[PDB]
Write a protein that binds this ligand. Structure first.
Ligand SMILES: Cc1cc2nc3c(=O)[nH]c(=O)nc-3n(C[C@H](O)[C@H](O)[C@H](O)COP(=O)(O)O)c2cc1C
Ligand SMILES: Cc1cc2nc3c(=O)[nH]c(=O)nc-3n(C[C@H](O)[C@H](O)[C@H](O)COP(=O)(O)O)c2cc1C
Ligand SMILES: [Ca+2]
Ligand SMILES: [Ca+2]
Lengths: 185, 177
């Protein structure tokens, strides 16, 4: 079944891909999970480029029951991508003790596509991005997602790309990410 | 100098009515209703590679739209965030605008007037935490209940928004001095 790794950052130079790459390759090389052949998709919101100010729909997304009911075509396309996901791993930075606007914008554009789906929040920042993790988990709860958990990944702020010597040390989180993902499958 | 920053940029929106309620609530005891639709700070288009916390003055911003946005914000004395609650959180348009600046928020008093089916209290809490992180002097927050799905608001509801007069006025008059 499909695992969507949704990146939160859309900054031109950013750490998000490195974290998303770690999460992808952690699931892939996992011994428990090599058998369940999960298919993995890294979703780049910089590439989707979901508009902030233009939105043809005037109905609340909760009021929308299916994809064809959306007046907006860019929403419908984003609706398909997310609907095709069975498990979602949000890989997100923390901006000012909160979640990035690009991620919140994309999350808020949809509704029924999130329902009941397991969601793991992998945050990152100077102190793991714990405050963003906390906040985003609550937004996922509001969407009635099955919030598996949240892992907070410490990085050295200001250093892109990550040092050679810290990349290996991301793998301290391997056991928790895998125990959480596996018991869900 | 008091700025009422609207959080919603939806085409059909309740936000301007609540901003109007807050405005006329104040001046019925120097306002500026800021519209982020009109300011139109881009979500994706950043010239700036510099994190706004590293920026010591407006000039360092490589972005023209950011410099003007800084100008507007840095000028203000008191800020009242009038914001809806989207899925137990704050709107992206408001978070995007907030995150583009840093030093301009330092020490500024800020009151959050949220709204929603139950006053948008969850958004109010979440936004206050972000404001705390920007080292703003957070007065507090007031949750304004609305009927949801009817825009503009049912006319009978607009007067009864004034239940929140006491609290907004109490919280505001204290900070004035
Ligand atoms: C707008 C802004 C806000 C930030 N806020 C925080 C924060 O509150 N806590 C933290 O630990 N790092 C914060 N950072 C530093 C980020 O951890 C760092 O820039 C990281 O690279 C952001 O992730 P990204 O490169 O994938 O966008 C912030 C950076 C910027 C851009
Ligand atoms: C993205 C989306 C999610 C929403 N989530 C909530 C919700 O979590 N709780 C709530 O009380 N209202 C929620 N609202 C309903 C709003 O209260 C109502 O639509 C309001 O008019 C939105 O404010 P605005 O018109 O100024 O943008 C949501 C609205 C939208 C657009
Ligand atoms: Ca917590
Ligand atoms: Ca919490």
């Amino acid at each position: 079944m499909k695992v969507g790794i949704i990146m939160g950052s859309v900054r031109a130079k950013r750490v998000c891909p490195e974290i998303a790459a770690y999460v992808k390759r952690t699931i892939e090389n996992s011994e428990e999970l090599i058998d369940q052949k999960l298919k993995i998709q890294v979703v780049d919101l910089q590439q989707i480029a979901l508009p902030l100010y233009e939105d043809d729909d005037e109905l609340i997304p909760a009021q929308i029951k299916s994809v064809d009911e959306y007046a907006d075509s860019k929403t419908r396309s984003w609706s398909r991508i997310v609907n095709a996901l069975d498990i979602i791993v949000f890989v997100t930075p923390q901006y000012n003790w909160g979640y990035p606007a690009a991620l919140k914008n994309a999350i808020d554009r949809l509704y029924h596509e999130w329902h009941g789906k397991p969601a793991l929040v992998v945050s990152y920042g100077g102190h793991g991005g714990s405050k963003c993790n906390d906040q985003l988990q609550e937004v996922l709860h509001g969407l009635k997602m099955n919030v598996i958990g949240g892992v907070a990944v410490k990085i050295p702020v200001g250093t892109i790309p990550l040092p050679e010597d810290i990349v290996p040390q991301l793998s301290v989180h391997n056991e928790e990410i895998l125990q959480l993902l596996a018991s869900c499958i």
